[PDB]
Design a binder for these strands. Structure first.
Ligand SMILES: NC[C@@H]1O[C@H](O[C@H]2[C@@H](O)[C@H](O[C@@H]3[C@@H](O)[C@H](N)C[C@H](N)[C@H]3O[C@H]3O[C@H](CO)[C@@H](O)[C@H](O)[C@H]3N)O[C@@H]2CO)[C@H](N)[C@@H](O)[C@@H]1O
Ligand SMILES: NC[C@@H]1O[C@H](O[C@H]2[C@@H](O)[C@H](O[C@@H]3[C@@H](O)[C@H](N)C[C@H](N)[C@H]3O[C@H]3O[C@H](CO)[C@@H](O)[C@H](O)[C@H]3N)O[C@@H]2CO)[C@H](N)[C@@H](O)[C@@H]1O
Ligand SMILES: CC(=O)c1cccc(N[C@H]2[C@H](N)[C@@](NC(=O)N(C)C)([C@H](C)O)[C@@](C)(O)[C@@]2(O)COC(=O)c2c(C)cccc2O)c1
Ligand SMILES: [Mg+2]
Ligand SMILES: [Mg+2]
Ligand SMILES: [Mg+2]
Ligand SMILES: [Mg+2]
Ligand SMILES: [Mg+2]
Ligand SMILES: [Mg+2]
Ligand SMILES: [Mg+2]
Ligand SMILES: [Mg+2]
Ligand SMILES: [Mg+2]
Ligand SMILES: [Mg+2]
Ligand SMILES: [Mg+2]
Ligand SMILES: [Mg+2]
Ligand SMILES: [Mg+2]
Ligand SMILES: [Mg+2]
Ligand SMILES: [Mg+2]
Ligand SMILES: [Mg+2]
Ligand SMILES: [Mg+2]
Ligand SMILES: [Mg+2]
Ligand SMILES: [Mg+2]
Ligand SMILES: [Mg+2]
Ligand SMILES: [Mg+2]
Ligand SMILES: [Mg+2]
Ligand SMILES: [Mg+2]
Ligand SMILES: [Mg+2]
Lengths: 138, 234
RNA sequence: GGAGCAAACCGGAUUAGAUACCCGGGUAGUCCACGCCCUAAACGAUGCGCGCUAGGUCUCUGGGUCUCCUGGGGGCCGAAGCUA
RNA sequence: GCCGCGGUAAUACGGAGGGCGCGAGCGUUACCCGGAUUCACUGGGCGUAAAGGGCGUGUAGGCGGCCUGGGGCGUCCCAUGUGAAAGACCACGGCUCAACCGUGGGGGAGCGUGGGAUACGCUCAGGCUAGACGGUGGGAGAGGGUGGUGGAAUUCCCGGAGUAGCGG
């Protein structure tokens, strides 16, 4: 039935990027959109947009890579090197603000759902809150 | 005036034998054949020629490689008509990657070039005016055009990069850029400067190979005719 | 119930020996019904369900505007990737 | 200690010289944690290395698509009570130092009370149709059960013809 739509979304991204796709659709959810917003603001994706696929709500998601590279294998560096669920149906992970982790000494994000909305670690730490630790992206 | 001279007989090529990474450069599958996008060839053309223009006037070198049979000869015309090196018969393992060593064979060729016009076209033991002179035959056969460049080239122009894959490999390995006339056959991503065309038609190979050697002399002044490039063309 | 086959067993060969391999017999059994047994190289040696990620080729079975397109199933080669 | 040394040239046994390491100690045995990501939460695995249950049905349990609203149990935040002393961390002090000790500061999981947030999880109520199920029409199939039935072959029985071997 699809147990974790967020893990799904993340993985669609992980997969499309590994073959340098220009875009992926992912079935649309408000929650999903909020995570993308962060994702876009932080420059992991180009951006995203609502669309209908067989007349059903998706979110097309424009991916984004490095430049062409030199020697053998000139496949671009990836912008999303790593993207990975934390909290999951099997095992939710919640943090207080004092235990929000520093992802790759801050060269990476952690998206994070709080009662003051979905936030990155920095946004949420300055806003002084914690909550469900959704995923870490570097 | 390139343009419709491409439609001339030089657009589309193979069918269901494709690499799907070549999908962007395809206009359609009319009649079960993959007709390659005419105009995207033009967008790739200028960018490529521009790299050649620059490379040409900087006094650098292209290595022409066409070993597939329809190109065999029209390559050695245009390469000679550009004072450039060419590889024609067999791409040898490490012409580039093991250049130093494969070079030593050029070194040997002109030791035997030096014994035909020589006092020893009369002497040498019996079984050595075949032993030595047949060694010069093969060296003549493979290292005709390769005899020219004596440092790695600055680029390579390849006719069918799938046919000529061992060559491309070495180029990239050494960070020599790769120009290529390629078609639905091939993986574009490992061609730096691509000319989406038709690796098969003697027309296509000709139209492109020649006009590229125009630019090469034309970056140096004083162009010549549209070339001896019509075998018994038909 | 029992034609044929055939553990055991009764004989013939072979062999140094031959409680076997080969030959000739041969009971249980193999067959049916009902009731037990519940094991296996019960193997894809691969738990079930769902989404996602190039293609090509052969095959079984539906539908379409039937050159080709689109489902379901069985194979082969193989992108990305994974693997000691 | 483990790998392993010793069978006439042993840096591995015993002694010598020399050297290394610690030093009022140095070794031994025993026991705990470590290394051991070798029970793996952090942090492992199961095609062939150990490891997928023979297969199903389905109970308890675990997990759960999209939209709106209510509650605020999880979750997050603020304030407050509690977390004794010793010990632990940091200062500054007392014994000549230190060990030992005095004073002061700083942390500290967890639990209580009051206030707040509502993204996600839960819950209550409402909606949807992408999951799931159903309806209409069409299909391929050694899926299963019961009854019937067909021809070939082997054995046996009876009859004919036939004669000296067959079989292996
Ligand atoms: N061992 C092979 C199979 O594992 C299957 O289930 C496992 C696999 O499907 C999958 O495991 C994947 C693995 O596929 C793939 N090779 C990559 C990944 N490292 C593994 O993942 C697993 O291990 C990593 C830690 O290594 C964990 O962080 C992760 O959460 C866990 N899913 O997820 C399951 C987690 O164990 C089945 N149990 C069975 O088919 C067989 O045991
Ligand atoms: N509370 C005041 C005194 O505090 C002391 O507590 C302190 C000392 O014992 C100890 O402090 C000293 C440290 O300050 C000084 N700069 C260096 C010294 N190595 C430490 O000493 C300690 O550590 C070493 C090794 O851990 C050991 O000798 C021993 O654990 C202890 N003496 O650690 C605590 C903080 O410095 C005594 N333990 C206590 O009996 C006395 O009351
Ligand atoms: C086969 C041959 O020349 C030969 C010679 C002498 C004796 C044997 N004996 C044979 C003997 N008849 C044997 N049977 C056999 O070989 N067959 C082909 C039936 C029997 C089972 O004992 C054998 C396997 O032992 C054997 O092959 C020998 O091994 C065979
Ligand atoms: Mg995808
Ligand atoms: Mg608290
Ligand atoms: Mg060769
Ligand atoms: Mg016997
Ligand atoms: Mg027998
Ligand atoms: Mg018998
Ligand atoms: Mg299989
Ligand atoms: Mg299939
Ligand atoms: Mg000795
Ligand atoms: Mg020793
Ligand atoms: Mg000794
Ligand atoms: Mg451990
Ligand atoms: Mg684990
Ligand atoms: Mg293991
Ligand atoms: Mg095993
Ligand atoms: Mg199984
Ligand atoms: Mg079930
Ligand atoms: Mg249930
Ligand atoms: Mg839910
Ligand atoms: Mg609450
Ligand atoms: Mg205390
Ligand atoms: Mg003092
Ligand atoms: Mg409290
Ligand atoms: Mg409802």
């Amino acid at each position: 039935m699809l147990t974790d739509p967020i893990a799904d979304m993340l993985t669609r991204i992980r997969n499309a990027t590994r073959v340098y796709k220009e875009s992926t659709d992912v079935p649309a959810s408000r929650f999903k959109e909020e995570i993308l917003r962060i994702l876009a603001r932080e420059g992991f994706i180009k951006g995203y947009e609502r669309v209908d696929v067989d007349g059903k709500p998706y979110l097309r998601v424009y991916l984004k890579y490095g430049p062409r590279r030199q020697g053998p294998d000139p496949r671009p560096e990836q912008v999303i090197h790593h993207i990975r669920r934390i909290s999951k149906p099997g095992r939710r992970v919640y943090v207080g603000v004092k235990e929000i982790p520093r992802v790759r000494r801050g060269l990476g994000i952690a998206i994070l759902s709080t009662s003051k909305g979905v936030l990155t670690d920095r946004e949420a730490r300055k806003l002084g809150v914690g909550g469900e630790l959704i995923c870490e992206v570097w | 005036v390139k343009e419709l001279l491409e439609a001339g007989v030089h657009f589309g090529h193979e069918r269901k034998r494709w690499n799907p990474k070549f999908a962007r450069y395809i206009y359609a599958e009319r009649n079960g054949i993959h007709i390659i996008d005419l105009q995207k060839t033009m967008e790739e053309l200028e960018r490529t020629f521009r790299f050649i223009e620059d490379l040409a006037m900087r006094g650098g070198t292209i290595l022409f490689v066409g070993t597939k049979k329809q190109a065999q000869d029209i390559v050695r015309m245009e390469a000679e008509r550009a004072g450039m090196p060419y590889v024609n018969q067999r791409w040898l393992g490490g012409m580039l990657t093991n250049f130093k060593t494969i070079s030593q064979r050029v070194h040997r060729l002109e030791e035997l070039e030096a014994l035909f016009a020589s006092p020893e076209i009369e002497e040498r033991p019996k079984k050595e005016q075949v032993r030595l002179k047949h060694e010069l035959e093969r060296l003549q056969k493979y290292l005709s055009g390769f005899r020219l460049l004596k440092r790695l080239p600055d680029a390579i122009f390849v006719v069918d990069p799938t046919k000529e894959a061992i060559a491309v490999r070495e180029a990239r390995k050494l960070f020599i850029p790769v120009i290529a006339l390629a078609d639905t056959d091939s993986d574009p991503d490992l061609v730096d400067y691509i000319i989406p065309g038709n690796d098969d038609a003697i027309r296509s190979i000709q139209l492109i190979l020649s006009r590229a050697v125009d630019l090469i002399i034309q970056a140096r002044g004083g162009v010549v005719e549209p070339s001896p490039s019509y075998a018994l063309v038909q």
